[PDB]
Copies of this chain bind each other. A is one copy, B any other.
């Protein structure tokens, strides 16, 4: 039993845990070190055309340290510029995987209430970034999943729940609270006061299993679309970082190596063993992350991962080129008068092409976690795109445009023009929000004692649209 066996007052604030676990606190805080913003839309402008009509066409960056999760959620152009608790583009579900205040609020107000209303609803309550309370019981300190949708998904897929799982399974599952593909299920409900309400509930599409194809079949069955494509009017599916799903099928996952084995390796000091809580790039700490199981140089092992990255990039660029062209050729056919009936099969191929390719690349570590499935998915997605494109030639020909050449989209600027994204307007609106309502949120939270100003040091020095210089 622990030194805090009756629980921790202020448990959502990781600083409250520091008196018991100074070592783990220190290393946890060190994800502050991973502060680079890589604008993925700049790196891969094809992604802009893929996500036209959807917020990811505005702003999409690579992950950085857990230290920045909450602030990046606030900064991203995707969450827009609320003026109050009732405005802004996105729902409350956007906080879910960003903060230990989330289980705090679910515990206080119930899952359905939590999932009701705008993202802006909780701006002055959900103020701590990914912390001890997202993974640890505040009495026993044992690993716990704090979000009900994980077990719900695990059960739906015929897996053991978190509590029924082994300790080694739990050492990946704590990560799977967030590092999985999800959608928002519109959920009608009535509260205690009998008021009718609508929740947007985080749901793992795992009821047919966890492969890309089973999830595709799941979504097709319920006729679900995340958005209607801004160019092709295809009913589109967005993949989000299926990190755990793809990991599960790769060789490491099959051999029972946990996320924690590479991402949180042990240091042995006599009788005591500590987990590195600085969650980052395992290739930065190979001696600890890899070399207890592998037996040659760091440089050789790094070279082999680099080869995997290169293969993935090659197939990614092919697949997203054909997907982008397919979208543009479809929009052209629409302009010439092609009907929904003439385009139905094409749009299905596009939906599936992009679902498979997005599932392949949306988990940034998947090229390594499950290298062969990643390559297969990109090949499968590209084949679907090409099937669409062959059919599109014939539709274009019917409408007198067989020689149409889809426009280029090789820069973020060109791509965003095609996708009709007015960035400068979005940025201007965002800055006003940050300068006004965001600062009010932080002020109120500090006054209430929900937020410790110490946690904000260097947290807001970068986004895709500013760099004050270092975080």
Contacts and interface: CB of A to CB of B under 8 A. Distances in A.
Size range of the interface on A?
20 to 34
Nearest to A397: B397
B315 A376 contact: yes
A255 interface: yes
Interface stretch (A200-208, A281-289, A381-389): A381-389
A41 to B, nearest CB: 24
Residue of A307, A378, A379, A403 with highest tally of chain B CB at under 10 A: A379
Nearest to A383: B318
Nearest to A371: B372
A296 interface: yes
A314 B390 contact: no
A53 B396 CA distance: 35
A304 interface: yes
A375 interface: yes
A372 B308 CA distance: 8
A394 interface: yes
A323 to B, nearest CB: 13
Interface in A354-402: 371-373, 375-376, 378-380, 382-383, 386, 389-390, 393-394, 397, 402
A432 interface: no
Given A386-B390, A390-B386, A397-B397, A251 B304 contact: yes
A311 B382 contact: no
A312 B106 CA distance: 46
B390 A315 contact: no
Contacts of A292: none
A376 B314 contact: yes
Interface centre among A254, A314, A375 (most CB of B within 10 A): A375
A394 B402 contact: yes
A379 B375 contact: yes
A280 B341 CA distance: 55
Given A318-B379, A322-B386, A390-B393, 7 more contacts: A254-B300, A318-B383, A378-B379, A379-B379, A382-B383, A386-B390, A397-B402
Across the A-B interface, give the 3 residue pairs with the lowest CB-CB distance, nearest first: A379-B379, A386-B386, A393-B393
13 contacts: A254-B300, A307-B372, A311-B372, A311-B373, A315-B376, A315-B379, A372-B372, A378-B379, A382-B382, A382-B383, A382-B386, A383-B386, A393-B397
